[PDB]
């Protein structure tokens, strides 16, 4: 199927970084055709992707008027903009292109070896499973240290929305637009109303990776986290593996199995490395105070985005510490999430 990868630009110059890879590892021009939608009006930036000739089609966002904020919003005109950009630029793919699908990439994002084999391999189970409403590129905790790097292959589901190198579907588009809001779109799509308990698909490690220090938004999440996501250098034939496990009905009943027949270990000898023979164990958690708390001791995310924390499925946090698998969860009494755990 057809799967075009739309780049988002505006005035870096870097999105040239941003598109070297892409094309560098692109499998296929007419299966994966490259759409850069650029907001701004940056004439170097523009010079930088015309430079690129017909290997892309450069499309610009036609209203670079300022937008009337809510007052509010002041200090916040560049996630107007952002949405306003998002808006026409989806409207571009799925209305006047017409495609099936596509994967957004924003423009200082750079690609894992294997990411075009991902989305190849993953769009057919986004097809299949209406629970699912995107496959991701992005593992929130997919820092070194925090993942298995002999289990490149290895995939998960979560209830967390990670954005940075996502694929949806036209149908998609079609629920979200109507409703697309003025700013902060992607804490928007978290949001249950958006939502609707579907999940996406995210892998153990991460197929994208950030290098725009500078942006809309100030530096510091970059400077304490983002930086540190380490991006996946092993070429994984997603295409050639059984993916069947990915399935609702298979992984609710398989991976909750798991997680929940792994002993329970007290967050303290999780930390100090005690009871090395279990390879794989579960920290539990029972309130707020406590996921926060033992999240911060095992060195994972801790912030919550309509109660649900970054890369969770039915509220647990996998990861690895010190080797070890660590399943950071709720009782297994656990039935949906709490907006007001903030
Ligand atoms: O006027 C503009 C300015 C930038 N853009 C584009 O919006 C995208 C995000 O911009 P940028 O990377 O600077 O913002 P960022 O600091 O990562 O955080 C935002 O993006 C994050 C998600 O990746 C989100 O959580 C956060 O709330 C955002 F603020 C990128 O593709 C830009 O080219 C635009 O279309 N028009
Ligand atoms: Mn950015």
Redesign the pocket.
Known sequence: AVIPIL??????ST?RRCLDKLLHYRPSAELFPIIV????GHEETAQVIASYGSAVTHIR?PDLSNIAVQPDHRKF???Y??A???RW?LGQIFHNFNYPAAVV????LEVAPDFFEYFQATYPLLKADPSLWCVSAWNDNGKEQMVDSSKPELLYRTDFFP??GWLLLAELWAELEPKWPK?????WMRRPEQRKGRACVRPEISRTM?F?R??????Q??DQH?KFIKLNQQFVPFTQLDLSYLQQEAYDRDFLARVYGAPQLQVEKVRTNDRKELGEVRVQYTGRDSFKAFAKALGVMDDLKSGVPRAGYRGIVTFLFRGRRVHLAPPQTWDGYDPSWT
Do not use: M, N, P
């Not at 780049?7 to 870096?12: E, H, K, Q, S, T």
């Not at 990439?105 to 200082?108: A, P, T």
């Open positions: 780049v988002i630009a505006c005035d870096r999105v939608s650029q907001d701004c966002q005109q560049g996630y903009k952002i306003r950009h998002y630029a990439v924003e423009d200082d954005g940075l700013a902060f779109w992607d804490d950030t725009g500078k942006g809309v938004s100030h530096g999440f970059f983002l």
